[PDB]
């Protein structure tokens, strides 16, 4: 509400997962700019010798 005190450049940005094909759009303060984001013993004995 208070103009100027609040951070500026609050553009809408897209978060894109590079390994999940997921695209989201929000207004994160960071035509959407794109940000890329990444996201027993008996058996062993029987296997060795049997």
């Amino acid at each position: 509400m208070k103009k100027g005190i609040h951070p500026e450049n609050y553009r809408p940005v897209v978060f894109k997962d590079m390994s999940n094909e997921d695209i989201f759009i929000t207004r994160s303060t960071m035509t959407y700019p794109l940000i890329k984001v990444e996201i027993g013993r008996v058996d062993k004995f029987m296997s060795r010798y049997g």
Binding site: I5, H6, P7, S28
Partner: peptide
């Protein structure tokens, strides 16, 4: 906090 939230803290 301001960067994380988008509003002054």
């Amino acid at each position: 906090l301001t960067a994380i939230t988008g509003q002054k803290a």
